[PDB]
Design an enzyme around this catalytic site. Structure first.
Site, mmCIF file in Angstrom:
data_model
loop_
_atom_site.group_PDB
_atom_site.id
_atom_site.type_symbol
_atom_site.label_atom_id
_atom_site.label_comp_id
_atom_site.label_asym_id
_atom_site.label_seq_id
_atom_site.Cartn_x
_atom_site.Cartn_y
_atom_site.Cartn_z
ATOM 1 N N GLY B 10 37.429 -34.684 48.337
ATOM 2 C CA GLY B 10 37.318 -34.697 46.885
ATOM 3 C C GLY B 10 36.185 -35.571 46.381
ATOM 4 O O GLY B 10 35.448 -36.189 47.140
ATOM 5 N N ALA B 12 35.924 -38.518 44.674
ATOM 6 C CA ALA B 12 35.898 -39.945 44.990
ATOM 7 C C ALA B 12 35.632 -40.175 46.473
ATOM 8 O O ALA B 12 34.807 -41.020 46.842
ATOM 9 C CB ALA B 12 37.209 -40.618 44.563
ATOM 10 N N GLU B 71 35.465 -27.836 44.752
ATOM 11 C CA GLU B 71 34.335 -27.331 43.992
ATOM 12 C C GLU B 71 33.045 -27.913 44.560
ATOM 13 O O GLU B 71 33.079 -28.882 45.328
ATOM 14 C CB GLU B 71 34.488 -27.671 42.503
ATOM 15 C CG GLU B 71 34.636 -29.146 42.225
ATOM 16 C CD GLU B 71 33.375 -29.764 41.662
ATOM 17 O OE1 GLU B 71 32.368 -29.034 41.495
ATOM 18 O OE2 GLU B 71 33.393 -30.984 41.394
ATOM 19 N N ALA B 99 40.996 -28.262 42.210
ATOM 20 C CA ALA B 99 42.435 -28.344 42.039
ATOM 21 C C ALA B 99 42.857 -28.756 40.641
ATOM 22 O O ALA B 99 44.062 -28.933 40.405
ATOM 23 C CB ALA B 99 43.027 -29.318 43.065
ATOM 24 N N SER B 140 40.745 -40.099 46.823
ATOM 25 C CA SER B 140 41.495 -40.629 45.700
ATOM 26 C C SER B 140 42.962 -40.225 45.816
ATOM 27 O O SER B 140 43.295 -39.182 46.380
ATOM 28 C CB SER B 140 40.910 -40.134 44.373
ATOM 29 O OG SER B 140 41.014 -38.728 44.246
ATOM 30 N N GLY B 143 43.084 -37.312 42.073
ATOM 31 C CA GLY B 143 42.590 -35.956 41.958
ATOM 32 C C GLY B 143 43.475 -34.929 42.646
ATOM 33 O O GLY B 143 44.347 -35.241 43.456
ATOM 34 N N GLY B 144 43.266 -33.665 42.263
ATOM 35 C CA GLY B 144 44.041 -32.585 42.850
ATOM 36 C C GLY B 144 43.684 -32.395 44.307
ATOM 37 O O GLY B 144 44.561 -32.199 45.153
ATOM 38 N N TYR B 224 30.736 -45.495 38.668
ATOM 39 C CA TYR B 224 31.128 -45.169 40.038
ATOM 40 C C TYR B 224 30.145 -45.710 41.061
ATOM 41 O O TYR B 224 30.546 -46.114 42.154
ATOM 42 C CB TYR B 224 31.301 -43.663 40.215
ATOM 43 C CG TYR B 224 32.520 -43.124 39.516
ATOM 44 C CD1 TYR B 224 33.708 -43.835 39.525
ATOM 45 C CD2 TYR B 224 32.491 -41.899 38.867
ATOM 46 C CE1 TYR B 224 34.826 -43.350 38.886
ATOM 47 C CE2 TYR B 224 33.608 -41.403 38.230
ATOM 48 C CZ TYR B 224 34.768 -42.133 38.241
ATOM 49 O OH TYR B 224 35.888 -41.642 37.616
ATOM 50 N N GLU B 254 42.716 -53.952 67.106
ATOM 51 C CA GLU B 254 43.447 -55.155 67.465
ATOM 52 C C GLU B 254 44.013 -55.809 66.206
ATOM 53 O O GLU B 254 45.127 -56.351 66.227
ATOM 54 C CB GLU B 254 42.511 -56.080 68.249
ATOM 55 C CG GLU B 254 43.157 -57.156 69.103
ATOM 56 C CD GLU B 254 42.128 -57.901 69.942
ATOM 57 O OE1 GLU B 254 41.930 -59.119 69.718
ATOM 58 O OE2 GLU B 254 41.510 -57.254 70.821
#
Ligand SMILES: Nc1nc2c(ncn2[C@@H]2O[C@H](COP(=O)(O)OP(=O)(O)OP(=O)(O)O)[C@@H](O)[C@H]2O)c(=O)[nH]1
Ligand SMILES: Nc1nc2c(ncn2[C@@H]2O[C@H](COP(=O)(O)OP(=O)(O)O)[C@@H](O)[C@H]2O)c(=O)[nH]1
Ligand SMILES: Nc1nc(NCc2ccc3c(c2)OCO3)cc(-c2cccc3[nH]ccc23)n1
Ligand SMILES: [Ca+2]
Ligand SMILES: [Mg+2]
Ligand SMILES: [Mg+2]
Lengths: 59, 440, 421
Positions: B10, B12, B71, B99, B140, B143-144, B224, B254
């Site tokens: 997506g 993000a 998209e 979405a 994210s 989002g869808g 962003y 570890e």
């Protein structure tokens, strides 16, 4: 070592069956929603035909 | 060997991917065309940076990464942008219709149409590995695609790669930066569905990143780009042990052993220092002590919560740059004598420490100062459950009225998935409570 | 790559459609011939949402023009920009509908609907990825109200997974004295509740009162009302036409704005009719709403605010938070973070700064009450009913339409009264 193999396989098995069940159930639900909407639109087309007939048989 | 495959899902996830891969290129001296003049082994090698980059016979260093969105416009910026030559086109996968902020479309209606192709391309990457360690998944919560497709993908990866490790970098929603009202729904659905399929997840609260950018970088309204450059600095700190050699470097795996006491309790709090502007960094050298102290200031946390009102279960410090153990030990001694650091009674209180000498890097024209030394703390604290509480509360407010739920039902979801996910979150909050109680 | 198909039906629908295309063609630097003569790549970056590219680097609106009256086909074609529309996209009948919903929906309009669908289908077939449809029409006449809702139903049958959006001009006695207007609106609302995802209630009551009281126009013409309508519609499509940052499609907007499928009738607003605080305060003022409803008589389920022009995003954020905090009682507490904000750098023509408001408020029930009252005033005496029964309609359909609009009112009241505790 056999118990470890078995637990990994059971995790793969159970996730595969859970995913397949979810995707099937989702497909059936979505198709049923669209089929109900279309059925309501077909009931509208039927009612529009009964209206056009009523109007014809009024004359 | 022991390579790692990165998956960016997506908007993000993709944009964070861009920031992360740009930064990795700068840290390793890889140009945007993929050439790395310092690498004298052409077409292969078992150098530390090969965990993240493969090599072609033509000398190109290629991220072991897949970008996926439903998209095309964000990934299209990757296709046309500065680093377009870094990636093979088959690594950049896009559908036509997103979405629409709807988990159900990303997991079912749209996601089902692309999942097999995505898996085939991931498989192509895995087959080039001689000892694949596992996956890093960037997305994210809100989002869808980042919620629903990521959940679907995690489930399929558990099928196809068994218990092979899977780590998340998860963007936790905040109302302060571009949000959808249904984001709490998507967050609970994806956390529920991914919980059993993820070994470790680093949550990044956009509100925390926003506050840090405003307060420490003097940015009035962070974009962003600002947030992702900072996020990428935290990601880079975390993966630096996988990507560089060195005698004081301590493997992320570890730390993972120490960070995860029970499979469900796998959400570490990240804290990073120093985040400082160039104007403030000038003539002010920050010492090991100053950055380590910062690690315990909640304003520097990646998730808003108060570790001072929970208990620690683990506490690791990942230093990079001009840092020697002597200064770490003196700083830790000071913090132990000065701060409210209480462990649960079933786990030792020693801090685990790693040092990487490769110094931190910044992107040119960025808002972060270049510093000689930096630190990322990863703590497993019960306080992180507060973030679930906030999200759970917003979910409840909406779900009691079924607000927006019809959008999910129309894509084939049932209300039972809502209440199942919510109950799983309730049990998670209860787990975080139970682990903080003292033993008999 | 993110195509919208636009439809305008009837006199009103075609008038406000034409004004809309004028205004956005100007915003994109497209002249009446379809040539690009702008100064900035931001004008063309999302041109495909509303325009097809034809040979010669011509941009042609993705627009279908429908009426039962062919005199509007002539008036559109000679109106400013009449050549820009695709000639095959003009679909016109012969004898009008005489403000008779049944002619639009069941008889004459049924006869023409297939040719309208043929044009719709040809436009849709060439979309890379159609997001959906917007229809401009009035609800008070015969063609737009009846035939438009027929077109909506047929599109839903052929494109059940696409978004259907309307800009629906609600009748008022202050603009039309045509006595049968409330029948046509109730019958239309009954359709809209079921078959659209979002409907902007553009109320001729509010537009008249704005032109008279606020803009000081003693004799408001249709041109003055439509100037307000076109400014609103330009505002409300700004975020999908200039994106800047926002990455959305009609479905994601709908998902953010429509919490219950039937409650999708929005109040548009515009300001000014200047500091950012003044825009923000005015945009939430009852006097700036395009539906004659006081939002302080109900509660907002959801709100979108779109600011246009060069301004401080910091200041916009601060003022939106200020208005929410100071007006918190008007926002339902059980939908957190229900106010969304967009900022576009490109202002509309003739303004440095403007705000467009989209509210999903339970106060919209006041609109439905108004229309409902006028409906009942006639239905209780069966006045003019023979106009409709003569086309085959039963009284029963009127009873059902009234009952459904009253149910919509009651549901808006239920969610206005609901509480979190
Ligand atoms: N930190 C950070 N968060 C982002 C970024 N881009 C989007 N987000 C957050 O992600 C959420 C929105 O989800 P997106 O990633 O844009 O949605 P998506 O994965 O593309 O899914 P759909 O677009 O609905 O199909 C919001 O919480 C945003 O604030 C980014 O670049 N950095
Ligand atoms: N705001 C506005 N309202 C209009 C316009 N033209 C017509 N109306 C309204 O539309 C209603 C008449 O319906 P109309 O669309 O003209 O009928 P039709 O085109 O034959 O279907 C009346 O109630 C008018 O108030 C216009 O240009 N602007
Ligand atoms: N539902 C809804 N909201 C709108 N407002 C703006 C907004 C901006 C950012 C947002 C947001 C909403 O919600 C999430 O972030 C416009 C529209 C619309 C309707 C019909 C046709 C249209 N052509 C272009 C647009 C549009 N539809
Ligand atoms: Ca200084
Ligand atoms: Mg997206
Ligand atoms: Mg008419």
């Amino acid at each position: 070592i056999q118990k470890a193999i078995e637990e990994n396989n059971n995790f793969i098995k159970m996730a595969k069956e859970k995913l397949a069940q979810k995707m099937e159930s989702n497909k059936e639900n979505r198709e049923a929603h669209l089929a109900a909407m279309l059925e309501r639109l077909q009931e509208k087309d039927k009612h529009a035909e009964e209206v056009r007939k009523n109007k014809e048989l009024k004359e | 060997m022991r390579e790692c495959i990165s998956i960016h899902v997506g908007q993000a996830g993709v944009q964070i991917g861009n920031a992360c891969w740009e930064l990795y290129c700068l840290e390793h001296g890889i140009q945007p065309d993929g050439q790395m003049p310092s690498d004298k082994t052409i077409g292969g090698g078992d150098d530390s940076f090969n965990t993240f980059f493969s090599e072609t016979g033509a000398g190109k260093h290629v991220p072991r990464a897949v970008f996926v969105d439903l998209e095309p416009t964000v990934i299209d910026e990757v296709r046309t942008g500065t680093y377009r030559q870094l990636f093979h086109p088959e690594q950049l996968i896009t559908g036509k219709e997103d979405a629409a902020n709807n988990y159900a479309r990303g997991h079912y209606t749209i996601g089902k149409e692309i999942i097999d192709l995505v898996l085939d391309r991931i498989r192509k990457l895995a087959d080039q590995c001689t000892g694949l360690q596992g996956f890093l998944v960037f997305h994210s919560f809100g989002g869808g695609t980042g919620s629903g497709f990521t959940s679907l993908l995690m489930e399929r990866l558990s099928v196809d790669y068994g218990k092979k490790s899977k780590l998340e970098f998860s963007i936790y929603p905040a109302p302060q930066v571009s949000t959808a009202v249904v984001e709490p729904y998507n967050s609970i659905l994806t956390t529920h569905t991914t919980l059993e399929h993820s070994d470790c997840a680093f949550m990044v609260d956009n509100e925390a990143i926003y506050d840090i950018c405003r307060r420490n970088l003097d940015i009035e309204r962070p974009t962003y780009t600002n947030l992702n450059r900072l996020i990428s600095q935290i990601v880079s700190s975390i993966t630096a042990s996988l990507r560089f050699d060195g005698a004081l470097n301590v493997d992320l795996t570890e730390f993972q052993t120490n960070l995860v006491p029970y499979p469900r309790i796998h959400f570490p709090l990240a804290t990073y220092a120093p985040v400082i502007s160039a104007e403030k960094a000038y003539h002010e050298q920050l010492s090991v002590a100053e950055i380590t102290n910062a690690c315990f200031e909640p304003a520097n946390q990646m998730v808003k919560c108060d570790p001072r009102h929970g208990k620690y279960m683990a506490c690791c410090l990942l230093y990079r740059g001009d840092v020697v153990p002597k200064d770490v030990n003196a700083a830790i001694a000071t913090i132990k004598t000065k701060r409210s650091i209480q462990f649960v009674d079933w786990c030792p209180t020693g801090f685990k420490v790693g040092i990487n000498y490769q110094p931190p890097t910044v992107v040119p024209g960025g808002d972060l100062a270049k510093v000689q030394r930096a630190v990322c703390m990863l703590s497993n604290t019960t306080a992180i459950a507060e973030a679930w509480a906030r999200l759970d509360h917003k979910f409840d407010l909406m779900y009691a009225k079924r607000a927006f739920v019809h959008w999910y039902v129309g894509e084939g979801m049932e209300e039972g998935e809502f209440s199942e996910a919510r109950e799983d979150m309730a049990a998670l909050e209860k787990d975080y409570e139970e682990v903080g109680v003292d033993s008999v | 790559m993110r195509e919208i198909v636009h439809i305008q039906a009837g006199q009103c629908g075609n008038q406000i459609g034409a004004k809309f295309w004028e205004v956005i063609s100007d915003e994109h630097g497209i002249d009446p011939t379809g040539s690009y003569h702008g100064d900035s790549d931001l004008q063309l970056e999302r041109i495909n949402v509303y325009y097809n590219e034809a040979a010669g680097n011509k941009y042609v609106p993705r627009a279908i023009l429908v009426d039962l009256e062919p005199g509007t086909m002539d008036s559109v074609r000679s109106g400013p920009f009449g050549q820009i529309f695709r000639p095959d996209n003009f679909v016109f009948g012969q004898s009008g509908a005489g403000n008779n919903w049944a002619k639009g929906h069941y008889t004459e309009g049924a006869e023409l609907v297939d040719s309208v669908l043929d044009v719709v289908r040809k436009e849709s077939e060439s979309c890379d990825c159609l997001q959906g449809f917007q229809l401009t029409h009035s609800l008070g006449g015969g063609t737009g109200s009846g035939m438009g809702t027929l077109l909506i139903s047929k599109i839903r049958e052929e494109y059940p997974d696409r978004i259907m959006n309307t800009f629906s001009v609600v009748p008022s006695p202050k603009v039309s004295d045509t006595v049968v207007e409330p029948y046509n609106a109730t019958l239309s609302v009954h359709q809209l509740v079921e078959n659209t995802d979002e409907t902007y209630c553009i109320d001729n009551e509010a537009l008249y009162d704005i032109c008279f009281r606020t803009l000081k126009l003693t004799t408001p013409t249709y041109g003055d009302l439509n100037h307000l309508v076109s400014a609103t519609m330009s505002g409300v499509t700004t975020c999908l036409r200039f994106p800047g940052q926002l990455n959305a499609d009609l479905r994601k907007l709908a998902v953010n704005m429509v919490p219950f499928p039937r409650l999708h009738f929005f109040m548009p607003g515009f300001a000014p009719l200047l500091t950012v605080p003044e825009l923000t305060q005015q945009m939430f003022d009852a006097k700036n709403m395009m539906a004659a409803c006081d939002p302080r008589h109900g509660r907002y389920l959801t709100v979108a605010a779109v600011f246009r022009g060069r301004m401080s995003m910091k200041e916009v954020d601060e003022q939106m938070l200020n208005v929410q905090n100071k007006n918190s009682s008007y926002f339902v507490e059980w939908i957190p973070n229900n106010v969304k904000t967009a900022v576009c750098d490109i202002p509309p023509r003739g303004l440095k700064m403007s705000a467009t408001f989209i509210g999903n408020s339970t106060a919209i029930q006041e609109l439905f009450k108004r229309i409902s009252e006028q409906f009942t005033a006639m239905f209780r005496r069966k006045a003019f009913l023979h106009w409709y029964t003569g086309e085959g309609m039963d009284e029963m359909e009127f009873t059902e339409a009234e009952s459904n609009m009253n149910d919509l009112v009651s549901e808006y009241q239920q969610y206005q009264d609901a509480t979190a505790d």
